[model samples]
Target chain A: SSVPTKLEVVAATPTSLLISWDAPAVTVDYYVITYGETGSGGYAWQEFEVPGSKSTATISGLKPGVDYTITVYAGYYGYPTYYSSPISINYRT
Target chain B: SRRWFHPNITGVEAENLLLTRGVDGSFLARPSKSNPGDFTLSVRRNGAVTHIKIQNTGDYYDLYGGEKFATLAELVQYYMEHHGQLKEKNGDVIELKYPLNK
Candidate 1:
């Protein structure tokens, strides 16, 4: 199934970004955010899980002036076994 | 000594000082030039310089279109310790966290 839409990624600090989205289904077990820097000297990809109740997430302690691909997937409520495809964006920090 | 106030400074100079030497949430107190006897509370918060004009002068601190206190530090501390207490007329908070000492 499709994931949340209207992905929003905003810079909060030189080292941070604020990510948000709209959950199609009212409730979900949880949301997972995965991201990785996109260019030279980039390290490994990293991911984090946030409570389904939340529509926003924060990615901080990131190095500035780099491009990253931010992706998210939702776990269907009451059906932790299933997950959505993903919604993502190329962001700069 | 309450070390954050710059007694002699121009508004433009204050803006540069705070932006260059301070990060967001940084601020300082300076004697107001336009309204003598009062002081200006300048802050580099929310990505810009917001200069607040405090009311009254000398040992006791009061505010007009502002709030309360004693000594410039007391007034500065009030905003620092109280979140969402200092703000724009529309309610956007003016957070005060660090001070530009020089």
Candidate 2:
């Protein structure tokens, strides 16, 4: 598939956030999740990969009471990754 | 009837169970000519991988420990029930969200 859709936060903890989304129409090898503190300029994003069969991911090691932006990308073996629309949320940790 | 074993638990639920507990898991597909729906769920902790087979019996599901589960939720519940028995990569017992309550 090209891009993941319907991304939303399903659960959250002080230091972790769980996100879920619907699979893409085409087959994807994996999903790349990029999240970090919201806003630009020197805010580095952390990335993680989840299996294609998985539609949810838990991002840990986050700061509490910080607003963050998360984006998911559908990755193919030999093709360019498709980035999903960004979603913003705040974590307690 | 086509069996659905992966629908009850979201990927986040499974991933949270492993990642939060400092463990790793791999979902493997072992389709065969006879049993084309065979799959395996392997958890890694302390350099050891415990492979749990997931079989489709048309009417139910079976795990490696010789137990039958009516749904994937039950299977996941079983895992959660024994979460403390599972070891992490560092040989520490995996922590459960609710130890005595659930």
Candidate 3:
């Protein structure tokens, strides 16, 4: 399977980001949400799982006025993971 | 048209909602073989089966899990709230989504 299509940030607060995307045409077993501070030292990628039926999620614990990179990955039960094109944005909390 | 509340649903609608949530199951509302106002829900996973019942009172449903819900939607919501995230037999976590659109 391939990455999710039309991934975008629908809204953002001082401490959180609300993201939404369309599911891939084929059925996916699940989705992985990955995000982190792009250039901040010692920061590691954080991953969260979204059910296949859901297309929206709120990622929180973000620093206000900081730039971050976020992306999504599609996972099949036994297939290789597919990564979405990464999107960068500044948190405006 | 789309419905947002569970009270507006029939057994067939609940069954479809369960399928969307990855629950291989069925719902039966007021089966002719049972009490006229009883609702039943049955589900299977990894060869195990779970059955639930609700007594329809036109105002609330009495969940066999020992709770009273105002609608079939509320019962499903409670199921998701408590059992949304499940661990597969192989250790993978399966998250079930509650259909917000009902």
RMSD of each: 16.9, 14.9, 16.1
Supply the TM-score of chain A against the true chain A for every candidate structure.
0.80, 0.77, 0.77
CAPRI classification of candidate 2? incorrect
State the lDDT of candidate 2 residue by residue for B21-100, as single tens digits: 43343332222211245443434433332323466677776553445788655654565676554442234453323221
Interface RMSD of each: 23.1, 16.4, 20.1
Cα deviation at B22, candidate 1, in Å, is 0.8
| Model 1: how far residue A2 lies from native, Å | 41
**Native A-B interface contacts kept, per candidate:** 0.00, 0.00, 0.00
Please list all clashing residue pairs in model 2, or write none if there are none: A1-A26, A1-A27, A14-A93, A63-A93, A64-A92, A64-A93, B46-B89
Q: Which ten residues in a row have the lowest lDDT in candidate 1 chain B?
A: B85-94
In the range A1-93, model 1's lDDT, one tens digit per residue, is 345888888546768889878886545666767676764221355655577789898887788887877767654332002233467788777
TM-score of 3: 0.41
Name model 1 segments beyond 4 Å from true.
A1-93, B57-59, B65-67
Score residue B28 of candidate 3 by CA lDDT: 26
DockQ (CA atoms), all models: 0.01, 0.02, 0.01
* lDDT score for candidate 2 against the true structure: 0.50
Error of 3 at B89 (Å): 22
Best by lDDT: 1
The clash count for each model shown is 1, 7, 1
Best by DockQ: 2
